[PDB]
Amino acid sequence: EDLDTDNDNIPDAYEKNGYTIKDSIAVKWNDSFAEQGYKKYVSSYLESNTAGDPYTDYQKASGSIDKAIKLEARDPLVAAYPVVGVGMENLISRATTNSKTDANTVGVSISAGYQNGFTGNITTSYSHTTDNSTAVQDSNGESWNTGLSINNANVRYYNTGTAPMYKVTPTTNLVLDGETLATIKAQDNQIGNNLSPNETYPKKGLSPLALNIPINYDQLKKLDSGKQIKLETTQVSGNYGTKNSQGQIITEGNSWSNYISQIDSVSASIILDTGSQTFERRVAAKEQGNPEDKTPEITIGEAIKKAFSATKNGELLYFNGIPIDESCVELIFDDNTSEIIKEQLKYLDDKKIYNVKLERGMNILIKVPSYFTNFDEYNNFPASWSNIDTKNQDGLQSVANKLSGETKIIIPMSKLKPYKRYVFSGYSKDPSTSNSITVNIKSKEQKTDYLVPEKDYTKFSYEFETTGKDSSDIEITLTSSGVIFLDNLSITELNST
Amino acid sequence: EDLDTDNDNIPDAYEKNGYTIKDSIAVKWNDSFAEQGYKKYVSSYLESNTAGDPYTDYQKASGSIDKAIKLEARDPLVAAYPVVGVGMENLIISTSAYINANVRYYNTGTAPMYKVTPTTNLVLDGETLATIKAQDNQIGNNLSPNETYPKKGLSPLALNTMDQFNARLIPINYDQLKKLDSGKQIKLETTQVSGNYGTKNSQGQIITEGNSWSNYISQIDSVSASIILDTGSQTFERRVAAKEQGNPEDKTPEITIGEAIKKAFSATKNGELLYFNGIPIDESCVELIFDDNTSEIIKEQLKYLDDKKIYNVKLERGMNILIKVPSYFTNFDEYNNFPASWSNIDTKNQDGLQSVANKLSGETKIIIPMSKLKPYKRYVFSGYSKDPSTSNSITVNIKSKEQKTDYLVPEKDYTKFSYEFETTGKDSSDIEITLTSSGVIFLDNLSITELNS
Amino acid sequence: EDLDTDNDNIPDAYEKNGYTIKDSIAVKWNDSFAEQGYKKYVSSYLESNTAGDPYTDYQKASGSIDKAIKLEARDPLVAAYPVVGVGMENLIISTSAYINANVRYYNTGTAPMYKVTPTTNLVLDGETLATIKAQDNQIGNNLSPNETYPKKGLSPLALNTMDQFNARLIPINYDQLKKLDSGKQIKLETTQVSGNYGTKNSQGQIITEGNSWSNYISQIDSVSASIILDTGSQTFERRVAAKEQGNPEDKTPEITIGEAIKKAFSATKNGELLYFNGIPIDESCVELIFDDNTSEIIKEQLKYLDDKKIYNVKLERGMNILIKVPSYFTNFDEYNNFPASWSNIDTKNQDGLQSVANKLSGETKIIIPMSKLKPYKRYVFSGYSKDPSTSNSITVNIKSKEQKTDYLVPEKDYTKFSYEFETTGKDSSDIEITLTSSGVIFLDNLSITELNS
Ligand SMILES: [Ca+2]
Ligand SMILES: [Ca+2]
Ligand SMILES: [Ca+2]
């Protein structure tokens, strides 16, 4: 019970069934350590570094590594990985804001009905967080050509990873929405000495970092007609902190380029966006062919909670006081990822996504709803639903709203964003199999569609554009032919037009 | 009791309950040692650097570190940190055109920073004109705590290089000077600083070549709570370590805000009052300012604590704090710096916070000249009010850029009130402050505090 | 009793009670060794370096250091601080324009500095034109204490190199040349100096490459008191270690100011008289100039000491002391350098400071020519008077740019008096100094010294 094959100061028996660190030694995990705040760790007993990151299984579990690393990376299965980028601020004479998911959700196809079991979507242009596309806010309608009519860059580096990056020298190119111009590099005075997780260089409250190119008349027209400029990142070279026997943290020589193709090839990317700040986590997983491989196999639900440090109250996931269970989030998978998920779902009795295994190579994106209401404990709609009744016990989680007649919901434009397209999400139920549902949208895109609830809840998805700050109000019509059950209704924000 | 988990030459029993170093060996803390001048240290027995700073708990307690390190940085809870800023002394621009800037670096932390090469930003209005890094001409070989480079009595160094090997400042086009003539000024902010620190090696020398502070800025910032003390002319910035919220294996000691301020500045305490350099920093004698997150935590923590004082809240990880001593302070006991005496004041009382109170029968009026007031500045009037009757209404009339007329409801016990007003112009109308009382009211610790303009 | 806490080959019993080095090993101090020249050394037993400089207490005491270090730096309580500053000797202005300067580095410390790289500021009036760091052409390989680079007899090295490698120095516009024609001079000051020290490796050869002085500058300054001596034509800076006030764990020896001057200059003492190199530097025979902190510190400490002698006050960390030998000093015993003889002087006395005083009955008037005087300079009148009667008032009439007429009330015992006046213009009115006494007064140790312009 003391044998150590990999020699990482963790006995093999403890490492395969569960262990935790007390007083800098490994102890066998027990059910009684939960209420004390302890966590349960499981890793691979054949590898010193299960995740691939520079820090071994013992250094991460015991925390004997950098203190600027998130607690999320102390799990042996979660890789410490500084996913960084460049955020465009000034266009030179007009500022812009930057969307980290515009270039991902632009390639998502949305229909009305959905196939059984599966409740996500499909993306054809999956991209990471380093793939940054802007959205100009000071463009009030006048063209960029106005002002000269004759035929520099202020940026701010952003981190969304888990581990700090020292000596940050990002490399980007001016892709000018269709053709690259210059593969700019920041050499001597634009280098960030340190870049902590969920922080930018310069820190909040300082003027934008300036980096120091022709533009043709043709790009001027296209930029003035429904196009935006983005500054994609090809690579970023940094360093990281390593302890010593002398005790100093040495971050010269150590690179975040040696381990990147090691971390990347063994970890399954999981991404979550709260609408204001974006996170990217890598979770280790095992390849099917190799029998000697010993990386533990855990569900997505365990992978979600171990990556974003959520809380498992009951059976639903809470992240910073927000429900992030599989029912009130939007999952946007890539092509083969959905093939793996859909193929695995036929044999599962529970038929819930968060209970399926996790394999290396999948690209899961989680997009939290903008406004979501479940009639149970949480609501953030600025106006409540009309004709709300809770005298029920047939809800998806706790209780559903008896849609018998008509319910009106209204939300002003100021609570939304201009030049956007949304997704209407919810679940419907009607055991009678004799009542239909028709819905019409009061917006700049007006459409009416029919649908019928089934025995149990099923997801329905509807979309509409919101373009123009100074426009009319938004009203949604929910008409029921009889006794209709509704629960877990939400709306989201997709790409920008 | 001879164990040593973390290998830092301090037994875990002595490290957990209180210890001090006598003749380069650690001994158990005894309460009779405070009379010999010794201090009581408490630290965490699972970490070699409790604060994340380069020097371990043993080196910080025994004082075997750089001799320029302040004595309040010898606490294993306070982090040795250079907080280096660049202050602009003059600006020169002339003829296209050439701009020349004179700067003088300022250090405020508790550690010297050798070989400083700060990175500064040149910004006019939103746009960062240039991000300049220090060359060989402009590198400060030393910067002692609370000192400047060049030192006092010396001309500041000029900053006029794009790149290495003799480059020159130059605006790109005439647009900058065209808008410069409009009446716009240039600010100066630093994005980052690079320097060294010294460690006495095995050969007895001090090496500052394989060392840098950049390795520890991120670590210090993530395990410590920022605390600032402002004395009007001088500024101080410290960092005090604190335990993680939901961490079972974290052993960083829990201390209160008042104790941490005593530790981080080495301010003496004569029983209850806290004095730094003869200037009180007591809870009621100073105005505390917090950010968004810090205010929420204290308010939540207050309702569960019986004393209901700010200084008794257990310190946590991550808050931001600011302490600004009021510019003009009256307490009717030992300090009255107001240029003009107050009206209708009665010192015969015994119900004040410390020694006496001021019973007011009617109203109090004060005339403040603008001679000693900083023009184009924002000020906040502060004081304590007590009324056992709780049946008198108090209105305030303050003359400023906009006249302020507000009502105040006194409480049973002493309560702190804050009123903000803005005054613009040195040669403007005289500032008038008026307060009236329906009956008899008590006054103590009345102050006017400077704030950002 | 061979305990060694610091492990510097000096047992704690010796280092606390006094020790001296015999045959390169330490032996207990015995009072009979004074006649043979053996000196008494005392230092702190909790630190390898008591003074903080690169060399230990053993190496400083036993002399196993660089042979170019002065003798008085071999004291364990005196640090080996090199104070290097540049000397701006000449100007060359010609075409904007081009500037050329000749400078000569100076050393006035106790230890040499190898590979000197000064940093120089060219300040005209408020603005700083450019900051210059030493090039490979102007890096001085060697610099002995109380010496120069280049050595005496060689022309100064030119200063026309703007930046690294070499580019011609140039004023940026015509504006500074415009005000230069008005009569504005250009000043040069030293912001910093970077240099190496010299230690021996395990193989016996002096290696000076990786060792740098900029490390041991902050440490030595913040652990030692600042002492300066000016001998009229030269200056000598010395820094002496002093204990911390409130530390209970610091065991640094405490010495009087009088002994501090004796150690820091190796000044010989024949009982009470102190000689630097034949020039007396006794407290009564020289006047001292202090800063703010030392002025209030010294006054408070006097009233607790009966003798009331400056040289008998303990040295504490941080004080700044300046010693300026009197340029014109007469004592009527063995020295009188005044060009003109005094009036109404009687040497028949036995109540003087040392042997005799001046039995003045009436008034004394002196005529001082401008042949041996510096125009546009300030001088301070110093001397001692004794009047046991305490019934005669003395008024002084000193001619200067502003005529000075002040009254003096001498005390029963000997008292020092200070009077300030300014001399302007070489071809100006003759300076008249006259003092009158109501009765018979005693005078001794009359001094005149030069101050800043
Ligand atoms: Ca193992
Ligand atoms: Ca392992
Ligand atoms: Ca429910």
Ligand SMILES: [Ca+2]
């Ligand atoms: Ca320990």
Ligand SMILES: [Ca+2]
């Ligand atoms: Ca420790």
Ligand SMILES: [Ca+2]
């Ligand atoms: Ca009181």
Ligand SMILES: [Ca+2]
């Ligand atoms: Ca010793």
Ligand SMILES: [Ca+2]
């Ligand atoms: Ca020693």
Ligand SMILES: [Ca+2]
């Ligand atoms: Ca005499």
